Structures are given as structure tokens and as C-alpha cells.
Design a protein around this ligand. Sequence first.
Ligand code: SF4
Ligand SMILES: [Mg+2]
Ligand SMILES: [Mg+2]
Ligand SMILES: [Mg+2]
Ligand SMILES: [Mg+2]
Ligand SMILES: [Mg+2]
Ligand SMILES: [Mg+2]
Ligand SMILES: [Mg+2]
Ligand SMILES: [Mg+2]
Ligand SMILES: [Mg+2]
Ligand SMILES: [Mg+2]
Ligand SMILES: [Mg+2]
Ligand SMILES: [Mg+2]
Ligand SMILES: [Mg+2]
Ligand SMILES: [Mg+2]
Ligand SMILES: [Mg+2]
Ligand SMILES: [Mg+2]
Ligand SMILES: [Mg+2]
Ligand SMILES: [Mg+2]
Ligand SMILES: [Mg+2]
Ligand SMILES: [Mg+2]
Ligand SMILES: [Mg+2]
Ligand SMILES: [Mg+2]
Ligand SMILES: [Mg+2]
Ligand SMILES: [Mg+2]
Ligand SMILES: [Mg+2]
Ligand SMILES: [Mg+2]
Ligand SMILES: [Mg+2]
Ligand SMILES: [Mg+2]
Ligand SMILES: [Mg+2]
Ligand SMILES: [Mg+2]
Ligand SMILES: [Mg+2]
Ligand SMILES: [Mg+2]
Ligand SMILES: [Mg+2]
Ligand SMILES: [Mg+2]
Ligand SMILES: [Mg+2]
Ligand SMILES: [Mg+2]
Ligand SMILES: [Mg+2]
Ligand SMILES: [Mg+2]
Ligand SMILES: [Mg+2]
Ligand SMILES: [Mg+2]
Ligand SMILES: [Mg+2]
Ligand SMILES: [Mg+2]
Ligand SMILES: [Mg+2]
Ligand SMILES: [Mg+2]
Ligand SMILES: [Mg+2]
Ligand SMILES: [Mg+2]
Ligand SMILES: [Mg+2]
Ligand SMILES: [Mg+2]
Ligand SMILES: [Mg+2]
Ligand SMILES: [Mg+2]
Ligand SMILES: [Mg+2]
Ligand SMILES: [Mg+2]
Ligand SMILES: [Mg+2]
Ligand SMILES: [Mg+2]
Ligand SMILES: [Mg+2]
Ligand SMILES: [Mg+2]
Ligand SMILES: [Mg+2]
Ligand SMILES: [Mg+2]
Ligand SMILES: [Mg+2]
Ligand SMILES: [Mg+2]
Ligand SMILES: [Mg+2]
Ligand SMILES: [Mg+2]
Ligand SMILES: [Mg+2]
Ligand SMILES: [Mg+2]
Ligand SMILES: [Mg+2]
Ligand SMILES: [Mg+2]
Ligand SMILES: [Mg+2]
Ligand SMILES: [Mg+2]
Ligand SMILES: [Mg+2]
Ligand SMILES: [Mg+2]
Ligand SMILES: [Mg+2]
Ligand SMILES: [Mg+2]
Ligand SMILES: [Mg+2]
Ligand SMILES: [Mg+2]
Ligand SMILES: [Mg+2]
Ligand SMILES: [Mg+2]
Lengths: 99, 82, 137, 148, 208, 10, 122
Amino acid sequence: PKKVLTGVVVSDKMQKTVTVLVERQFPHPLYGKVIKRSKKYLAHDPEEKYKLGDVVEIIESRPISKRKRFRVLRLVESGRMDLVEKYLIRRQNYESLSK
Amino acid sequence: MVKIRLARFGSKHNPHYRIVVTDARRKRDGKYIEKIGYYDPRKTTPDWLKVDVERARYWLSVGAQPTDTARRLLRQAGVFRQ
Amino acid sequence: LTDPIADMLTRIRNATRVYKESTDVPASRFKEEILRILAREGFIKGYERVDVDGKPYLRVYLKYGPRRQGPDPRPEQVIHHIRRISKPGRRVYVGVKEIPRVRRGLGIAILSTSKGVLTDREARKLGVGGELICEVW
Amino acid sequence: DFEEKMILIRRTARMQAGGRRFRFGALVVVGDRQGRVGLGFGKAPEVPLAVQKAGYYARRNMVEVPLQNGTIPHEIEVEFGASKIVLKPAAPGTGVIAGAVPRAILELAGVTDILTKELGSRNPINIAYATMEALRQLRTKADVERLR
Amino acid sequence: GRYIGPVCRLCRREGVKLYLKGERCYSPKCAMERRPYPPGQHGQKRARRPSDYAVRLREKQKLRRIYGISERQFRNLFEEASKKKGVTGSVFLGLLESRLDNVVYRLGFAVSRRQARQLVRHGHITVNGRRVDLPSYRVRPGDEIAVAEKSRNLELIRQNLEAMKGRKVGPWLSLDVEGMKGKFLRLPDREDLALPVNEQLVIEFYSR
Amino acid sequence: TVXPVXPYVX
Amino acid sequence: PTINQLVRKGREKVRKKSKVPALKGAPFRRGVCTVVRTVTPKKPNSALRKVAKVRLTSGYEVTAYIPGEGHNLQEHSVVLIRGGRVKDLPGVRYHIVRGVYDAAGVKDRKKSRSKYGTKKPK
RNA sequence: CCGAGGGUAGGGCCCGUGACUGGGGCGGUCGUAACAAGGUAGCUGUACCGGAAGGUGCGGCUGGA
RNA sequence: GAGGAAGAAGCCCUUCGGGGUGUAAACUCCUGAACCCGGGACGAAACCCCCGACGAGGGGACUGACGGUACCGGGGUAAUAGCGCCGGCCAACUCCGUGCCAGCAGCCGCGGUAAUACGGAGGGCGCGAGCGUUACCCGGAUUCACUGGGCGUAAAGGGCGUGUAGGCGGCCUGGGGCGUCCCAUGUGAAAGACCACGGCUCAACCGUGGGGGAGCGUGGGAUACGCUCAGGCUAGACGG
RNA sequence: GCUAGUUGGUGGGGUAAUGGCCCACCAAGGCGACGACGGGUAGCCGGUCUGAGAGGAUGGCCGGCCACAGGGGCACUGAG
Ligand code: SF4
Ligand SMILES: [Mg+2]
Ligand SMILES: [Mg+2]
Ligand SMILES: [Mg+2]
Ligand SMILES: [Mg+2]
Ligand SMILES: [Mg+2]
Ligand SMILES: [Mg+2]
Ligand SMILES: [Mg+2]
Ligand SMILES: [Mg+2]
Ligand SMILES: [Mg+2]
Ligand SMILES: [Mg+2]
Ligand SMILES: [Mg+2]
Ligand SMILES: [Mg+2]
Ligand SMILES: [Mg+2]
Ligand SMILES: [Mg+2]
Ligand SMILES: [Mg+2]
Ligand SMILES: [Mg+2]
Ligand SMILES: [Mg+2]
Ligand SMILES: [Mg+2]
Ligand SMILES: [Mg+2]
Ligand SMILES: [Mg+2]
Ligand SMILES: [Mg+2]
Ligand SMILES: [Mg+2]
Ligand SMILES: [Mg+2]
Ligand SMILES: [Mg+2]
Ligand SMILES: [Mg+2]
Ligand SMILES: [Mg+2]
Ligand SMILES: [Mg+2]
Ligand SMILES: [Mg+2]
Ligand SMILES: [Mg+2]
Ligand SMILES: [Mg+2]
Ligand SMILES: [Mg+2]
Ligand SMILES: [Mg+2]
Ligand SMILES: [Mg+2]
Ligand SMILES: [Mg+2]
Ligand SMILES: [Mg+2]
Ligand SMILES: [Mg+2]
Ligand SMILES: [Mg+2]
Ligand SMILES: [Mg+2]
Ligand SMILES: [Mg+2]
Ligand SMILES: [Mg+2]
Ligand SMILES: [Mg+2]
Ligand SMILES: [Mg+2]
Ligand SMILES: [Mg+2]
Ligand SMILES: [Mg+2]
Ligand SMILES: [Mg+2]
Ligand SMILES: [Mg+2]
Ligand SMILES: [Mg+2]
Ligand SMILES: [Mg+2]
Ligand SMILES: [Mg+2]
Ligand SMILES: [Mg+2]
Ligand SMILES: [Mg+2]
Ligand SMILES: [Mg+2]
Ligand SMILES: [Mg+2]
Ligand SMILES: [Mg+2]
Ligand SMILES: [Mg+2]
Ligand SMILES: [Mg+2]
Ligand SMILES: [Mg+2]
Ligand SMILES: [Mg+2]
Ligand SMILES: [Mg+2]
Ligand SMILES: [Mg+2]
Ligand SMILES: [Mg+2]
Ligand SMILES: [Mg+2]
Ligand SMILES: [Mg+2]
Ligand SMILES: [Mg+2]
Ligand SMILES: [Mg+2]
Ligand SMILES: [Mg+2]
Ligand SMILES: [Mg+2]
Ligand SMILES: [Mg+2]
Ligand SMILES: [Mg+2]
Ligand SMILES: [Mg+2]
Ligand SMILES: [Mg+2]
Ligand SMILES: [Mg+2]
Ligand SMILES: [Mg+2]
Ligand SMILES: [Mg+2]
Ligand SMILES: [Mg+2]
Ligand SMILES: [Mg+2]
């Protein structure tokens, strides 16, 4: 089936497009322990109806552009600015890690 | 087109084919679609021919073509005898 | 307090080695469920649902072997060995095919399942797997 | 009765104003091949004397070892500090898969199909003691149930 | 291939009588009956205590030497027993007993397994009618180890048959004499034989 | 690699 | 280290330094001798170990050992070398293989002829 | 229009090599710093000094009295 | 291959009586790899011709490089043995030569006149159309430690705090079912591996059959623990 | 720390077809310690070798897919 992923919107700075930060879990293939990785998909918002902090289901789709191959399938949970701050901060934390 | 052919296995001086369906253009012992029988043409045993006649009739119906010496063996254990 | 379970098991373990008649440990439904198995397998006499300054604990009544003659009297233990397998660090989760026989039979390996906190013999039997809580012998 | 095996014999030395004055140590296991076994470390101003003495102590200290047709009832792993011996049970198809110390103790214990391993320091004297107290800690479902 | 060369010396190395020769073996002209001591310049010398290695070495050697077989086939057989279902020490002994050049021996068609080989190889023997000339054939239970009926007219086979009128063969064998043929009824049991091989030892050896 | 008078060159 | 530590940093797989790098892969190599001499070895030995400085076909130049009694090797000898060092001759990390190229086997050698490139007598 | 590549000019990383120079590892000359309160307890960070070990100052440690 | 001496010669050792090679050999018979003669393949029944109908089915003919090879039948000669090792690990011990020389060497190390360690000899051990060596991989190495290690003094606690991300996190009850567990279903090609049966005289090799896993897709179920959402508590924590 | 067809947009060209694949314009994005960018090195897998297993090592031959045809670029013909 067409893959359906759930993540937050982390950027609405783009035209008819949003960024969806999707966590996922799994066990370590040698150390057992469960771990989270994550992945930013660029989603088609053909009617700029999605905002920041908006948890959304995005489904796989025929290509819309370079690196945009998923549309927002349904609003799931709106206003999670708490999960954004998470990302914004980690990202911003980088400024310190240069030389 | 698609075919019913003799994929050779076995050893040197040990022909043990596999009457098989594949695309005309594989390497002869290359990756086929389906196996539909064996055929030890040396007959060193009881059952040296084994055609799943059910399947041999399907492939024929969709469009498959057969080696002239495949029907030699498809006919021999009768696929066509109405 | 980070893992109550290994705590409990440790109170148990720390208790047996000094031969405390019983040992006190705070309470969860989950800890009774465990202790339930320990008793129903004869690792402990048993346990009561008691109270120190109005706080829900469990008194656990400890079992040992007989006195012994020689230079060291101390009774061999009932619980020789108990330790945590699954942990908040590394979660251990066995499916049924992969549930581990213990001590070639002699001990158990409690675990936790979609159909209750079973033993290992008991789970293979009932047909499920889950979170390898610990092991006792 | 009891068959012996010399398993380690070694010279040592103690210094004194005239030079090295030696002494010998003999480590000996003894049993029947049906279930009694003992180990004795014996030391004297002489080899065959000290061998004699160990054998006296070996027999003067023995162990249950519950069998089960040539093998043990359950796995067991015992550290005697630094030295850790592993005991695993095996079918009659196998053999006495051990180093020359664990083997020799377990042949007289009349074990005959067991898997072992010598992790840790493999000082013989200590691996020796570790295999004993390993056997010494074996139990059958019978006493396992008898405890509960 | 097979060893060849001085064979009294094997036994006297081995500290034990093996029946590698034939007639002489039972005679008191056997050198072992006279010199039950290791061959070469150091024979009568107050030997030094064996090593566990030596111990398992020698036990293996005798067991192969007994059958006069290549170190490689012996090992080849042995690993297969270990793969095969059930007791390895026995299944081994069984598997190397099922070897055609050895069957011809128990059945007494010849004196030594050495002599036996040559029979099978030359075609003088067969199995289930059809001639078979390989000393390695897995004699699989239900089988007719006849003489090549067209080589029955010979001074040696009759002769060893002459000497086999009523000795009780293996419990797993059925020597119908005169007709010059036996039958491999069932592969041997462990206790079903007592050669001087502590089979548990050949196992511990190959597990080094 | 080469040398004094050797046609060998190494 | 914790399980987390291990997830974060993994364990470090440890590599082996080859002791015959001049060999540049190969089982053996062909060389020509640039020097040929005797060398006295380290304590507690005392000898005149006979060696050879050798220009490999890799451009590399190593010094090799010459094993046995007497040898026919000299400046410009075409030579073949296997690895393996000599304990007391430090720097010498390779062995000259007798009976190959201008390396003679050893005359009058009966035992171990293989290791000395000597043909069997009659 | 783009375009293999050619040319020009300026940069970045790598390799090899270089008069000469710095220590580093392996196999007589000067003293005797360390090992015993080692003949000024020893070590230490730092600083200055001295053929060389090392000495001295300041503070620290005991693995010292 | 069966037999063949209280046991040749030569060689080795020795206390000078002997001891060893050694049933080994020479000899006795018996078989009969090579070669010699004869015969001699399956691998090839279809395309094609005929009757039927150019189909079903029936009938007949040509075609073999390997190759006059395999194999079968008769005849039939005693018919290659070599390499490593014998201080310890490690199975196998003596003399002579040599004298820190010459040389050995994987590590410990051996050799400075009595060397089981160097060279040869005898003998022994081990393998055998092979035996050794070099190169490289995994092994032993629980010496990168998930299974399955550690840090007072052996290598190893950051000089000390504060806190970001991250990891981890009390007791009770509800919702969800993401992790986790179970069943069904698809996929997990063939070869291989495995177990049984068979094929070439065995086997290597080779055929047929069986058994499947993990892992992913789909559907169903479970709800203890982990998660998440909601409500509650006071034993952690903070505060008066 | 990297990025100017860079990341998104609307239009169009191209194809058997989606797409910054290509062009014009407009918007200011896109990626990055869960390792971007850069440097080394390698065709990947079925398998193979080792190992009690976990793990390590490896991809010759047979099968499967990619890639290349002296070094490069190009398009024609064509179901391809
Ligand atoms: S037993 Fe007699 S004949 Fe058989 S081998 Fe030993 S010595 Fe030779
Ligand atoms: Mg678009
Ligand atoms: Mg004591
Ligand atoms: Mg310890
Ligand atoms: Mg050691
Ligand atoms: Mg040590
Ligand atoms: Mg008991
Ligand atoms: Mg004949
Ligand atoms: Mg092994
Ligand atoms: Mg010297
Ligand atoms: Mg020396
Ligand atoms: Mg020359
Ligand atoms: Mg030349
Ligand atoms: Mg240009
Ligand atoms: Mg340019
Ligand atoms: Mg040009
Ligand atoms: Mg430079
Ligand atoms: Mg001084
Ligand atoms: Mg001083
Ligand atoms: Mg002083
Ligand atoms: Mg001092
Ligand atoms: Mg100072
Ligand atoms: Mg001066
Ligand atoms: Mg001064
Ligand atoms: Mg001071
Ligand atoms: Mg120190
Ligand atoms: Mg005599
Ligand atoms: Mg004589
Ligand atoms: Mg004599
Ligand atoms: Mg003879
Ligand atoms: Mg034909
Ligand atoms: Mg007609
Ligand atoms: Mg002919
Ligand atoms: Mg051929
Ligand atoms: Mg013939
Ligand atoms: Mg002869
Ligand atoms: Mg060897
Ligand atoms: Mg030895
Ligand atoms: Mg000399
Ligand atoms: Mg040598
Ligand atoms: Mg001397
Ligand atoms: Mg000498
Ligand atoms: Mg040597
Ligand atoms: Mg010598
Ligand atoms: Mg061979
Ligand atoms: Mg290694
Ligand atoms: Mg490892
Ligand atoms: Mg290390
Ligand atoms: Mg290392
Ligand atoms: Mg660990
Ligand atoms: Mg350690
Ligand atoms: Mg360091
Ligand atoms: Mg330290
Ligand atoms: Mg500190
Ligand atoms: Mg936090
Ligand atoms: Mg959390
Ligand atoms: Mg909790
Ligand atoms: Mg689920
Ligand atoms: Mg498959
Ligand atoms: Mg067969
Ligand atoms: Mg199959
Ligand atoms: Mg709450
Ligand atoms: Mg567009
Ligand atoms: Mg468009
Ligand atoms: Mg682009
Ligand atoms: Mg543009
Ligand atoms: Mg703009
Ligand atoms: Mg990521
Ligand atoms: Mg490159
Ligand atoms: Mg490449
Ligand atoms: Mg291991
Ligand atoms: Mg390939
Ligand atoms: Mg190209
Ligand atoms: Mg070319
Ligand atoms: Mg080109
Ligand atoms: Mg070109
Ligand atoms: Mg064409």
C-alpha cells in the first residue's frame, strides 16, 4: 500500500509545501535497546491549509517535484508547538559545534 | 515471446534437463518463470518425464510457445489428447 | 528510584543472604503478580499486603533449606540466584519459540504477557511471548 | 576402590642465605567413575612423597556429583576468583570436552558426556578448585523439589 | 593408497595384538607374542608416562590401522557420524564396518582385511549379484556379498571357505557357505563387538 | 632502482 | 560502558598491521641483490649471519636472510624472497628461497631438502 | 543556445624528494640523579639556571618520615 | 595378497653377553593395474513423408563431436614413493662431527669439546600422490566483551560545578494499541545448506522429494510491561 | 558546516510517463552531530569461508541486478 507516515510540521516557510518531521522507533540490531531515528519529508499542501506544529499523516504519492513525494493525508493533532521547539533547539544547538 | 523449453541441469555426461517456462531470451540455464516437469532423457530411472499437465495447458493458453522437442515430451505424456 | 523490580528482587536477594525471616518492599499490583509466582513456585513461603506509616508495602516471607553440619551451618537457599533480564536500559522481549529453558529445567523465568505475568513453562504452554522480566533458581 | 591422577606437579623455591632451597607441590584428583571425587593439593620436600600426601587429602575430601548417565543434570558456572569454569550438559554422542584439568577431575567423577569452558585465569590450581566447588553445587529436580 | 610394509611393528608399537596379518597372528610365530614391546632401537626401554595427547593419539591410530584405511577417509567417516543422528562413537564404528572390504573379512572370505581388499578390487567379490570392485562401497543392509561366481574355481577362496564351515559369524551377518555368499542383515550394534578401541577416545581426539 | 652495469632494472 | 554508550559509540574493530608490507600483497617476490654481506646478531647470540640487501620488483628494497651453509649469491644475483623474519637479525624481515633463480640449493643436504631447495640423491 | 575538450589565471588537499637540522629507537668517555633516611626523603605543576644527569624557588601529594 | 627364521647379509647402537632395523627381505605359492584380442554404447525422437483434417491419435525414416571412448568378454605382466617432523607446546631418541664456529628459529630459546635443539647416520613419529613453506581470512582472542570485560593500587573517574540535546525515570484507575506478544495470508526465485530416497560400479559429482526460518506487506486478536492521552494520589523532588 | 537550478512555487519544453529533467519568471528557501559537505576505499545480493553461537571475514566460479565496450562526448534508426 501507499505508505502513510505520521509527523509534525516543522516548516511552513515554503510555497504550497510543508516539512514533516517523522520519528520512528526500532530495536538496536546488536544492543537490543529501542532507539528513535527521524526524517524530514517535504509534503504537498496544495491549499496551504497546514500550519506549524500541526501533527499530520502524510501518504506517499506520485512525484510533485524534486524531493517532494508525499502529500498531507489528514490533519491529526493541531498546535504541537512543543515538538517544534524540540527540533528548532537541537538545530540551533549546532551553532556551538563549529570551530 | 514467452516459451516452454529445456533448461539443462545435471552434470557433464549426465543431461538432466528441466522442462521449463521462460522468456525466449534468457540464458538457457538462466532464471525462468516456472518449472513444469523434469526429463532425464537418459532414462536412468522410472519417471524420466513429469509434466504438470495442468500448468502445461495454462501456459499454452496464455500464449507460450514450446520447443519442437518439448512437445516431443509434452505430447509423449499427452497434453493434447482430446 | 529507577527500577522497582530489580529493587524488589534485590531486597529478596539481599534479604536471603543475612537470613531475614521476612523482607519489606513497597507495593505494586505488578510486584504482587511477581511474588505470586515466587510463592506458587515455592521460592518464598509467601507475602502479606502490609503497612509502615500508612505506606503500601509487601512483607515477603523467606524460605531457606535446613541447617547443615560441618563448619558452616547456614542453610542452602531456595532462591540461589535471581537477577533482572529485561531492563529500562535494554528491554528484553522474547517471542514464544525463543523463550529460554533455564538450568536444564530446574529454575524458572518469569515474564510478562498479553495474557498475564506467566512463567516460562507456563507461557510455552499457553503459547505466548513477552518481556523476559527475570529468572530464579 | 579409588583411581588417582597426578594433574600438576611443580617445584617452587624459598630463598635463604645459602641459595635456593626448593620444595614440591602435587595436585591430585581421585574417584571411582561412578560418582565419588576428591582433590588434594599436597606439598613436601620431595616429589613422590608430596604426591603421596595429596592423595591422602584428595580422598580426605569428596563430592556428591549426581550423575545422569555420564552427564550432569544442569549447566553451572562458578568463579573461584580470577578463574571461572563453565559446565554444560551433553548427549551421549559427545565426550569429555575439557582442558586437561577439568577433564581429569570429571573423568574420575565418572562423567562421560559434558561440555566445558575455561574462561578467566586458567591457573590449574585454581581452575582445579573451581571445577570442584562447581560440581559441589550441583542439584537434581529431586532436591530442587525437596527444597520447595 | 593403503599403508603396505612392516606390520608386526604396528602391533608392537600399539602395545596390543591387532589382527592385521592372517594365519601367523594366531600362531606363536607372531612377533608380538615374542616382543610385546615398541619397534626400533628403544623398544625395551622403561617408557615415560603418556600424555593425554599421546593417549588419544594412539587409540585413534590403532582404530584406523586395524581397518587399514587412509587417515583422510577415517576422518571423513568420523565427521559424518557426528553429523548423523544419534551416538557418534557407535555410528562411526558402524559406518566403517559397513565398508565392503571389511564385510568380506568378517564373512571370512579371506584372512586379513589386507588380503580382502585385493579380492574386492580385482572383482573377485560382488554385492547383490552385480560385480563391485571398490573397497569403499557402503554395504547397505539387505545385501548379497557373493563371490564373483565366475571366480569361484580358485585355490584361495575355497580354501578360506574350507576353513569357515561352522564358526559363528557376526550376529549381523548370514554366511550361507557353499553358495559363497553372505547377507548384511542389519548394521552392527555397539556391544555387538569388542576390538581394543576405547571409542570414546577417538572422539575426544578429533575434538581438539 | 637500476645500477652499475646491469640490464636488470628494479 | 552502558548500552546507551554502545549505541552511541559502538565497539571498535581492531586491525592487524601486516609484517611483510614490502610484499605488496604477493606470497613471494623477485628481487636483485644490491648488497651482500655478513652481520653480527644481538645478545645473547654471536654469529656472522649471512644476509642480502634486496631490490624488490616493487621498487622497495629490503634486506633478506640467506638460510643454510654456504651460498652462491652476490651483487646482481636475481633472487626470490618469501616473508618470515629472523629473530636476532633485526631489520631482516624476509627470507631468500633457495633453489630458485640464481639462488642455489645446498650441496650435500639430505634432511629437509624441501626447505633448502635440494634435489634428491641416488 | 548548450556542448567533448583545448587554453589562461588564481586557489585547496595528497604523494614523492631536498643542502642542512631536531630529536627517536637498536648495539667507549664524564659524572652518580633514582632504588635503602640512597647518603640533601621522593615525586610533582611551574619557573629560572646548569657539560650531563640534575639543582634551586613557590605551591602540592605520600606512593615517606 | 596368504606364508616364510628365536631371526642371513649390509647399516646403526652396546656394558662386548647382546639390543635394532625385521616378516622386513631373499625364497613359497595365489591373485592380476598396465598393456594384448574381440565386441562396443545410452546420449535420438522430433522437425520431415503418409492415413486422419496440415488438429487429436496411429504409423514409419534420416541424423552422434565426444568416440571404436566408456563399459562388457577373453587373454594378461609383481607392477611409482615421496615429503614434514622426533628440546617444550607436540607423537617420535640414540651415536658421530662441530665448539657462541658453522648454523636453527613460531614464541620460550639452542651452540662457549661429553648438543634428544646445529650437520650427517640409525632408529622413531606423522602424513602418503602427495608432504612442507610463504601470503591472506575466521579461529583460538571473554584481547572491542550484545551473548561475553573493565577503571582504589595493574591500562583506565572528566580538577570542580552549572546546565542544552539525549538517555532513564514513583503509586492507583480509565482510553488508545505505537512498541511487545499470537494466529491466518502473501512474499522470502533457481542453485546452495539441511533430512530422506534415488543416479552414474562407490564416492566427488549429479536428480527427485521433503522441511523451512529470519525479515518485510495485508488481515484478526491480546493488553501484562514500554509508549501515548485523560483523571487521581503523596512515599521522590520543590516550597511555607 | 554544505547549497544559486540550491529548496518550493506558477507557466511552459521534453518523454512512453512523473519530476528543477530542462527554460522563463517569482518566493527565500533546502541539508546538517540521528554526521550533512569532503576525503579514502568497494560493483551489490543469492551465497561463500570461519565460529558453540552471537559475531567476524569475504563476493573467484554458477544464478540475479547494475555498470562499462581504447579515453570521452553526442545523437540516428528503432518495440526497444
Ligand atoms: S599379531 Fe602377530 S601377526 Fe598379527 S600383526 Fe601383530 S605380530 Fe604380525
Ligand atoms: Mg511542481
Ligand atoms: Mg586449602
Ligand atoms: Mg573477578
Ligand atoms: Mg597462561
Ligand atoms: Mg600467566
Ligand atoms: Mg544432590
Ligand atoms: Mg581371469
Ligand atoms: Mg574442531
Ligand atoms: Mg654471546
Ligand atoms: Mg646464544
Ligand atoms: Mg651473478
Ligand atoms: Mg639471471
Ligand atoms: Mg566549458
Ligand atoms: Mg574547463
Ligand atoms: Mg581541442
Ligand atoms: Mg615538502
Ligand atoms: Mg645517588
Ligand atoms: Mg635528588
Ligand atoms: Mg637523596
Ligand atoms: Mg625514597
Ligand atoms: Mg621543582
Ligand atoms: Mg661546561
Ligand atoms: Mg642553581
Ligand atoms: Mg615543597
Ligand atoms: Mg604508578
Ligand atoms: Mg637374538
Ligand atoms: Mg643380527
Ligand atoms: Mg647380533
Ligand atoms: Mg609379505
Ligand atoms: Mg544414440
Ligand atoms: Mg493428409
Ligand atoms: Mg577394441
Ligand atoms: Mg570423459
Ligand atoms: Mg580383464
Ligand atoms: Mg615383490
Ligand atoms: Mg609435521
Ligand atoms: Mg613428545
Ligand atoms: Mg668449524
Ligand atoms: Mg630442523
Ligand atoms: Mg657444555
Ligand atoms: Mg656431541
Ligand atoms: Mg627442532
Ligand atoms: Mg640432531
Ligand atoms: Mg586422493
Ligand atoms: Mg588472528
Ligand atoms: Mg570476537
Ligand atoms: Mg588488545
Ligand atoms: Mg590485540
Ligand atoms: Mg558487556
Ligand atoms: Mg580486562
Ligand atoms: Mg593512552
Ligand atoms: Mg590508574
Ligand atoms: Mg576527582
Ligand atoms: Mg531533559
Ligand atoms: Mg521519557
Ligand atoms: Mg512508570
Ligand atoms: Mg501491533
Ligand atoms: Mg531457495
Ligand atoms: Mg546409490
Ligand atoms: Mg529441491
Ligand atoms: Mg497525571
Ligand atoms: Mg513545472
Ligand atoms: Mg509543469
Ligand atoms: Mg538539478
Ligand atoms: Mg531558471
Ligand atoms: Mg527572490
Ligand atoms: Mg536521520
Ligand atoms: Mg578513489
Ligand atoms: Mg573499484
Ligand atoms: Mg569464542
Ligand atoms: Mg558473479
Ligand atoms: Mg565510459
Ligand atoms: Mg584495452
Ligand atoms: Mg567509449
Ligand atoms: Mg570511442
Ligand atoms: Mg532491430
